[PDB]
């Protein structure tokens, strides 16, 4: 059970490689995507990023899917991090919903050049 060390702006994190391989389409779960961040001198992946957020990102893998934003981290900074680590649109949607955001629709005109014109001013 090979271990992996992820250094977030100096804050050291460790996990098992099988914990990350659980989600292959994310940055950390894909060897090819994280390769870019590997430091062979120290045997760690280094990210020059936001520190308070990573805890939750790593717990998402350990928990098997739980993505909770830390109370001390702004929603805009966290969401940028969820996007950076490429957790995917599903996790993101689950996150926004639980965060209190659910919207989706918009029925445009049939593209009648007429209907869509009348509907817009009414």
């Amino acid at each position: 059970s090979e271990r992996v060390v992820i250094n977030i702006s100096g804050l050291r994190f460790e996990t098992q490689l099988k914990t990350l391989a659980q989600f292959p389409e994310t940055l950390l779960g894909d060897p090819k995507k994280r390769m870019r961040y590997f430091d062979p001198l120290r045997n760690e992946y280094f990210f020059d990023r936001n520190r308070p957020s990573f805890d939750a990102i790593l717990y998402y893998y350990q928990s098997g899917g739980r993505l909770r934003r830390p109370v001390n981290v702004p929603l805009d900074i966290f969401s940028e991090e969820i996007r950076f680590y490429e957790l995917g649109e599903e996790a993101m949607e689950m996150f926004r919903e639980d965060e209190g955001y659910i919207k989706e629709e918009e029925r445009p005109l049939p593209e009648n050049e007429f209907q869509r014109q009348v509907w817009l001013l009414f």
Binding site: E2, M35, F38, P40, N43
Partner: protein, 326 residues
Amino acid sequence: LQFYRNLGKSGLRVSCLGLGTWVTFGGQITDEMAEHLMTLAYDNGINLFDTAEVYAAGKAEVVLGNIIKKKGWRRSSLVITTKIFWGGKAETERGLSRKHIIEGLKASLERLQLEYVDVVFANRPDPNTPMEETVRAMTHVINQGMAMYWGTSRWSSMEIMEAYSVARQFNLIPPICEQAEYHMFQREKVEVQLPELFHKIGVGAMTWSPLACGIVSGKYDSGIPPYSRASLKGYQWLKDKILSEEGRRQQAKLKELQAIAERLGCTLPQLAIAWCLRNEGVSSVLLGASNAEQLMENIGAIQVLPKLSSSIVHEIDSILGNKPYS
């Protein structure tokens, strides 16, 4: 195109072709012929020579060292490598324990009449020895000036990475090369598993048996020639492979490859060897040769290398039908 290349990402520069001594030196060929192969190789720019404590019970090292001493070549112009694992009948004379690495390397150095080798290799993985012990022993022989670098042979990428992490953990020296079997009929490890290691931790590949002991040369299209390796006393296992149902299938595929060779204007051995060098991850190919003609022909593989276009490579893949899935 570049005759010389870095061994992995280390600073050690080796010719893309090296000369090995398994079966031949101190065994199948005369010392006179061995001196002749080595001279020819050295005069042609080849600076890499590989041997092992196990070849001919140590005589391969004795013959290699005799030649280097007799020719007077400058030690700094050579890259000598040797492998440790099977060094005797006693229980403590085999494996990668600290005792056997130090004692085995020291005895090879004595047989080679050299103060040190450039690269010492673990001839194979050792389940019975903690990685830490092995990595500390290899690091020890390097600090004692008995070797310049160390590498692995027949280890899985998982084991190679374990040596590397153990090295970082204890501030030791990581391996810089893996000596893997590689030819048209054995592609998995070198094409699928080793590249990640090359790019991630700098470990390069130094492949062996590029002609699968002669099988890929085409010399076995009509049976076992006299004086061929397959006919030597002690190599029945090779004879069994050639004549087997699988052996027959290989020989039939080789006839298909011959047409590729003619299109590229080269011989099958040249094509087979150049094919091993088409990808960056391979630092050097260790050749085997029982006479001077073979060596002079095989060295010509370097002229073929520039012609291996994606088109030609795809064709060889179609014929071999064994391209491993990434």
